[PDB]
Amino acid sequence: QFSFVGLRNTTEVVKTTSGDYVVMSVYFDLSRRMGYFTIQTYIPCTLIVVLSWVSFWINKDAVPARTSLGITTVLTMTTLSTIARKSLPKVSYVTAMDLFVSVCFIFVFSALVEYGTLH
């Protein structure tokens, strides 16, 4: 996942109930790489957003075709969001991947609502 950037050492006297203890700590600095996450999460979400986009070029008269494309897009977007969040731990705050999937939700849902108001 990460790349080892470097190491750094510290030596500090921590105070606790049993006494004062000298603690020596090694910080390894790790920087994440997103290539697997791009081919894993970001690329599929961009491709499904393009799938939402292609609905506009489909003729408006094709009600089942438009509706089917929109529903398949938004529902598989929900599934992709679920698996992407499964990759993460159980933490209560929105992350950058969560922001991207939320924006993708907005796009696909907006395309479906665009055909809803167009019809």
Ligand X SMILES: *[C@@H]1O[C@H](CO)[C@@H](O[C@@H]2O[C@H](CO)[C@@H](O[C@@H]3O[C@H](CO)[C@@H](O)[C@H](O)[C@@H]3O)[C@H](O)[C@H]2NC(C)=O)[C@H](O)[C@H]1NC(C)=O
Question: CB under 6 A: which stretch of 11-19, 37-45, 90-98, 100-108 binds ligand CCCCCCCCCCCC?
Answer: 37-45
CA atoms within 13 A on the CB side of 111: 27
DSSP 47: H
The answer to whether 43 contacts ligand CCCCCCCCCCCC (rule: CB under 6 A) is: yes
Identify residue 97 by its one-letter amino acid code: M
- Extended beta strands in the chain, E state: 2-16, 19-32
Window of 23-31, 36-44, 95-103, 106-114 that interacts with ligand CCCCCCCCCCCC by CB under 6 A = 36-44
Q: How many CB atoms lie within 10 A of CB 116?
A: 11
Please give the Cα distance from 8 to 13 (Å, whole number).
17
- The distance of closest approach from Cβ of residue 16 to ligand X in the complex, given in angstroms and rounded to an integer, is 23
Q: Tell me the window of 8-16, 75-83, 84-92, 109-117 that interacts with ligand CCCCCCCC (CB under 6 A).
A: 109-117
- Cα separation, 53 vs 45, in Å, equals 12
* Residue with Cβ nearer ligand CCCCCCCC (34 or 94): 34
Closer residue to ligand CCCCCCCCCCCC (CB): 46 or 102: 46
Q: How far apart are the first and last CA of the chain?
A: 47
Binding site for ligand CCCCCCCC (CB under 6 A): 38, 42, 46, 54, 57, 113, 116-117
